[PDB]
């Protein structure tokens, strides 16, 4: 939180002018209610007197009062317009300045700052918190000021027309204030009604639905739905008392409102029988002051909004005002004119800003000569993009030096540094633009001639020029409408048009084939003239095109020198060379286990929308018992009415408590059902559904933790909202039509123009809502683009282009907001001012009626108030609502998530259950290419089989079908060109659950939930209790009890999320057990033990051959120390079995 006078610091002279004039006409919108009263006082006295003596002088006097009314209504037309308009405009300027400068400093801010933050958070922030601040500074403040204005105006205008009554009433005033403040905090705080309690269960509905492999691999889809319950329950356990609290508080709040009207009516009915005041005069005081403190009550949601703002703007303004050390946009430093590619890395030390505990550079010695190449190569995935992101200063080796031409890398300007170097990124890193405009991102000023020179200067012609309109055919998001060779190679041309002085490669041509290499390695090594190139190689094809060979070893460089002189040196490369809708009826049937709650709740609601016609008939009587004569019996009736008010006080205590508590617990019921139903039927799918982007981890979790609550709303909150607003305008329209229909008609005419201001002040999107969602997404697409793939933007130093596109797309939300402000100021002002013109025309027509015989003032003041305030009440109730038609989309989503039938339905008994699964597979010509990555073949012709009790192992390149065959035997997917059958019998006929009982797996990446370790390791067999000694037998078996006996909490400590409260060596041998519980048959230790030191591991294959007998084994591991106990041998060659 930052304080009232810093959240406004982005205001220009004309802003302060809009705010100041919007504030003085806020204050002058305010005092418009009291003066309406003052004339209401004098017209009440005129009516009661004149009709009491029996005269069209009444009509001409009511005329003059109609002018005072209309005049004040036009005054409020103008002052409401100016209030809302200028306040929204001042927020528009301030918020686009905040937005532009936010983006500017979200790019200027470092990269490690994106080790800290994830980009879903950041895009929420940039589209959610900015609209929080827009709410805060936008218009909340103008209506807050108009509230406090009319408060003081009622105060001051009671005093000036009676001071006793004003004192007795200003006495209770805190009561009506705090009361309307709670009645108006409730009908908002419902919609959200969430702090951080659900999170106790959401933690597991998220972490254990993002680790959905280990949760399918082991049948454990009940030890993750049960626990989900046993936290939803313990959330219910407090949600109950808190619904009790909220509804007792609203019951009280109306008990105090009605006690207040009773006190005030007694007192101010004694002062009017000793003739001190008058009917009108007494009204003026109470009504001015009551609506004063009611309108100060009902601005508790606005005083909440302003603080939501202040608390968002704290974190936005602090993101902005940081000056990250390595300043992209800075001019600090020197820039030379003659630069050579003599690069050196000496005693550098870069520890990560997130995970500083994995040290990967521990004192280097790397030297290069101007022009000639190098060779930075090593084992698979050994952290070498480090070198590709430490020179362009994305990060900083803290205690070292990156020497370029006798200088350190820091005293160079960064905007000039990252300009003289260009790279080819390991995975082709495209910006979502056409080819030509993909390339201009290299230098921003590159014309046709150089485009062609640099696109053919590496043979990048045919595969681009085949498809038409080459430079308007767009290429795909994340690499979606182009291939692995048509896309990758282009990353040489762009980062060439830069005309570099050094160029770099992170395995530029890993997925570039032989003839592709024979047409690229020319541009690759004809590149050098006097400039360096830093090679990170994968193959052994052109590493020989070098004079230097620098190896990777324990974070310390070891080998260097020429090829022949080093063939005797015994280095490291020495080894390398050898949605459908769903009706109302269906969302209502979703919970028919509560007919009683909806019945009691809805009859309560019908007995709360009827308090308004109650008031209407009550002070229809009051205007008749306060006539002339009989002053002795006039004090009797007013005491009966003090009483009546008290009794409805207590009734509505009980009616409001019931209504609330009833629909609150029915909502909670429906919510817990929907949550657990969705989560069950969301562990019941294949993994051909949980890899997509329509179904992320946070997408699913969003649907759980938000669409449940919203369908909860839309089921029966609408039932109430309709029952009230039927018994409230319905009953009032009915009564009004019984008593006087002519004036009722004239007021129905206006009802739509009065019940709009209440919904506008907290709607502000009517012909704009979907519009806002559209224009802001279409302008933030660039935000998202440059915000996700940001190593490249910040690596090309091609961010100012993205910034300026951002700006010129913001120019759309800006004229949107301007026409928004102006048409919404107009609708708000005309609704408001039509209230006063309502008083005027209604009472003029009324006085005509009265002097015609067609009515009687007691009835004109029944009708007027019944209808006008059924209207304002419809406003207040409607504008306090959860957006039914929003959560009907939640309804449709949830339903479609229920019904889907996964062809790998794990929750089915249909199938064949053999008894002794002999540890045999039978793979007759199996093939499978990814379903969504539809074409890249990971398995293009294979055939295997293991024998019962034998061992085998597969070794090769990065991911060449080592794992993607496991997803075929675990039967996540059904292979399309092939036929899987186990033990000689075919799979698809097998029961799928049984199938995942005999089959054991362990993980190259073993992961554990947020639980103790009584359960965590027992997981491996649900459908039977896992004993205690079973867990410890495994612990000695898995060779983890050699270290288990250290934990102060031996077997019951609370471990974190998916390898958090563990180490890199520990978990390598923990998942051993979580499948060794079922006593499976087929072991798949896919590098399950890789980070265990040599001292602790090899013993793993001792308790796993004196027991491994009686069952088979498959292996995927790069451990030459154990590969050599094979029986059958099958090898990768181009993803084929030779």
């Amino acid at each position: 939180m930052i304080g009232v006078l810093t959240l406004f610091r982005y205001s220009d002279w004309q802003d302060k002018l809009f705010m100041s004039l919007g504030t003085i006409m806020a204050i002058a919108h305010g005092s418009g209610l009291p003066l309406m009263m003052i004339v209401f006082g004098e017209m009440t006295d005129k009516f009661v007197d004149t009709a009491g003596n029996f005269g069209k002088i009444l009509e001409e006097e009511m005329t003059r009062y109609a002018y005072y009314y209309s005049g004040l209504g036009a005054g409020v037309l103008v002052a409401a317009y100016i209030q809302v308009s200028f306040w929204t405009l001042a927020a528009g300027r301030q918020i686009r300045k905040i937005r532009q400068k936010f983006f500017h400093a979200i790019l200027r801010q470092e990269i490690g700052w994106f080790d800290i933050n994830d980009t879903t958070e950041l895009n929420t922030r940039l589209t959610d918190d900015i609209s929080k601040i827009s709410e805060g500074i936008g218009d909340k403040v103008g209506m807050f000021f108009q509230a406090v204005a009319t408060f003081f105006a009622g105060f001051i205008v009671g005093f000036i027309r009676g001071w006793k009554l004003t004192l007795v009433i200003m006495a209770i005033s805190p009561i009506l204030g705090l009361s309307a403040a709670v009645w108006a905090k409730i009908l908002s705080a419902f919609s959200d009604k969430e702090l951080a309690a659900y999170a106790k269960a959401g933690a597991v509905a998220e972490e254990a639905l993002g680790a959905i492999r280990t949760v399918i691999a082991f049948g454990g889809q009940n030890k993750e739905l049960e626990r989900y319950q046993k936290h939803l329950e313990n959330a219910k356990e407090i949600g109950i008392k808190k619904a009790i609290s909220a509804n007792i508080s609203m019951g009280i709040a109306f008990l105090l409102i009605y006690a207040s009207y009773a006190l005030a009516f007694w007192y101010g009915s004694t002062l009017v029988i000793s003739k001190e005041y008058t009917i009108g005069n007494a009204m003026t005081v109470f009504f001015s002051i009551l609506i004063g403190a009611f309108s100060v009550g009902q601005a508790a949601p606005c005083i909440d909004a302003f603080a939501n703002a202040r608390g968002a703007a704290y974190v936005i303004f602090d993101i902005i005002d940081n000056n990250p050390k390595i300043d992209s946009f800075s001019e600090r430093g020197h820039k030379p004119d003659s630069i050579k590619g003599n690069l050196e890395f000496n005693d550098v030390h870069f520890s990560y800003p997130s995970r500083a505990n994995v040290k990967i550079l521990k004192g280097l010695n790397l030297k290069v000569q101007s022009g000639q190449t190098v060779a930075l190569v090593g084992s698979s995935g050994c952290g070498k993009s480090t070198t590709v992101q430490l020179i362009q200063r994305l990060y900083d080796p803290d205690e070292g030096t990156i020497n370029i031409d006798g200088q350190d890398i820091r005293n160079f300007n960064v905007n000039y540094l990252r300009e003289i170097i260009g790279v080819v990124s390991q995975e082709p890193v495209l910006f979502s633009t056409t080819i030509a405009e993909n390339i201009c991102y290299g230098r921003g000023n590159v014309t046709m001639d150089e485009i062609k020179k640099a696109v053919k200067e590496a043979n990048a012609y045919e595969f681009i020029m085949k498809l038409p309109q080459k430079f308007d055919t767009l290429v795909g998001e994340r690499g979606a409408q182009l291939s692995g060779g048509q896309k990758q190679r282009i990353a040489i041309a762009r980062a060439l048009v830069r005309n570099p002085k050094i160029l770099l490669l992170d395995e530029a041509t890993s997925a570039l084939d032989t003839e592709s290499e024979a047409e690229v390695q020319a541009a690759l090594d004809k590149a050098r003239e006097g400039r360096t190139t830093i090679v990170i190689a994968h193959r052994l094809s052109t590493v020989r095109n070098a004079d230097v060979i620098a190896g990777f070893e324990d974070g310390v460089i070891v080998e260097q020198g020429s090829h022949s002189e080093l063939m005797k040196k015994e280095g490291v490369y020495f080894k390398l060379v050898n949605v459908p809708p769903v009706s109302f009826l269906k969302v209502l049937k979703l919970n028919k286990t509560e007919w009683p709650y909806f019945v009691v709740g809805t009859v309560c609601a019908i007995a709360n929308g009827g308090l308004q016609p109650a008031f209407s008939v009550i002070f229809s009587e009051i205007i008749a018992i306060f006539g002339p004569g009989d002053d002795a019996v006039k004090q009797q009736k007013c005491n009966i009415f003090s009483l009546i008010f008290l009794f409805l006080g207590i009734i509505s205590f009980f009616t409001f408590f019931l209504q609330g508590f009833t629909f609150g617990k029915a909502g909670e019921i429906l919510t817990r059902r929907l949550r657990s139903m969705a989560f069950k039927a969301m562990l019941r799918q294949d993994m051909s559904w949980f890899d997509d982007h329509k179904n992320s981890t946070g997408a699913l979790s969003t649907r759980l933790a938000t669409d449940a609550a919203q369908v909860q709303g839309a089921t029966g909150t609408r039932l109430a909202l309709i029952a009230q607003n039927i018994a409230n305008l319905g009953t009032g329209i009915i009564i009004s039509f019984i008593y006087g229909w002519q004036l009722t008609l004239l007021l129905l005419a206006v009802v739509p123009i009065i019940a709009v201001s209440g919904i506008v002040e907290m709607k502000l999107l009517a012909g704009n809502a979907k519009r806002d969602k559209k224009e802001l997404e279409a302008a933030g697409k660039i935000a998202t683009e440059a915000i996700e793939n940001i190593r490249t933007v910040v690596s090309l130093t091609q961010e100012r282009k993205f910034e300026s596109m951002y700006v010129e797309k913001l120019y759309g939300p800006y004229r949107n907001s301007v026409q928004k402000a102006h048409i919404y100021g107009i609708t708000f002002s005309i609704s408001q001012a039509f209230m006063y013109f309502s008083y005027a025309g209604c009472f003029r027509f009324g006085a005509y009626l009265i002097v015609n015989g067609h009515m009687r003032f007691r009835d004109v003041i029944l009708v007027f108030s019944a209808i006008v305030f059924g209207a304002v009440a419809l406003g207040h109730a409607s504008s306090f609502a959860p957006d039914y038609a929003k959560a009907k989309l939640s309804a449709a989503h949830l339903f479609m998530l229920f019904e889907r039938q996964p062809l790998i339905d794990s929750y089915s008994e249909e199938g064949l259950k053999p008894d002794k699964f002999e540890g045999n597979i039978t793979f007759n010509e199996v093939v499978f290419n990814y379903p969504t990555r539809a074409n890249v073949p990971v398995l293009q012709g294979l055939s295997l089989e293991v024998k019962k009790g034998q061992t085998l192992a597969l070794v090769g390149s990065s991911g060449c079908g080592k794992s993607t065959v496991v997803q075929l035997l675990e039967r996540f997917y059904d292979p399309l060109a092939g036929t899987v059958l186990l033990d000689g019998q075919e799979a698809k006929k097998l029961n799928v659950q049984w199938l995942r009982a005999q089959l054991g797996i362990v993980s190259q990446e073993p992961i554990l939930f947020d639980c103790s370790i009584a359960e965590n390791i027992a997981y491996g067999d649900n459908s039977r209790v896992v004993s205690q000694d079973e867990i410890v037998s495994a612990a000695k078996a898995a060779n983890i009890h050699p270290f288990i006996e250290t934990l102060p909490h031996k077997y019951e400590t609370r471990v974190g999320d998916k390898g958090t409260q563990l180490s890199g060596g520990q978990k390598q041998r923990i998942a051993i057990a979580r499948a060794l519980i079922r006593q499976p048959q087929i072991l798949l230790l896919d590098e399950a033990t890789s980070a265990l030191d040599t001292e602790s591991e090899k013993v793993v294959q001792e308790a796993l051959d004196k027991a491994r007998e009686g069952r088979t084994c498959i292996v995927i591991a790069h451990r030459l120390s154990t590969i050599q106990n094979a029986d059958l041998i099958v090898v990768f060659q181009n993803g084929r079995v030779k």
Partner: antibody
Amino acid sequence: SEVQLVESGGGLVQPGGSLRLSCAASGFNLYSSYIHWVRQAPGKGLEWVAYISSYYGSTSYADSVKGRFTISADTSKNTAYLQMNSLRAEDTAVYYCARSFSINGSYSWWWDQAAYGLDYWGQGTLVTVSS
Amino acid sequence: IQMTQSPSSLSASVGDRVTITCRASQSVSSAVAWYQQKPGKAPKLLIYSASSLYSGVPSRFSGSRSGTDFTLTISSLQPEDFATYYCQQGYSKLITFGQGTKVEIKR
């Protein structure tokens, strides 16, 4: 396109076993009109057996098969699934997927449940109940 | 809630009034359909709610409703006729199809 109701699954099992009458409805979406299952007794006549209106969530099974048949409208991948259980003796009739009527074509409504005729049909697979 | 054909096994001639009377349930209230199934297939729709005729269908099927009576008279009987009928009732959450009839060629 044309109203096509194509069938998979079912046909061969002992009495006392499940069958999955799957009915891909191509030409339209499941959620606009009713999808009954119907019965051709072995040269005896036809019969309604069940239906699922999947824009109201409503279902109904026949008096002789109550408790054994669970329909579902897999209306994200546009199929109608029918789970049958225990398949007792007199279930050797040929079961078809039938579509009820629409007064307009772009919707059906819960009022007048399939009273304006069975305007479209398909050909299902034969089934048998024997050891 | 059931359907009862009167004229089973129609065996009359080609070119004359041949008519079917299938008596309905208690309160069917004009909710009948009349269906032509050819052998070995699934039926067609001809008339629904006792009066209105399907489209792309020959207009030689005359339907009448006399209170609790639904009557189907065909008089042309081209070679494509002489196949099974069905009178099926769908009402009050239950539907039952009639024990279908058969139009024969007369010899």
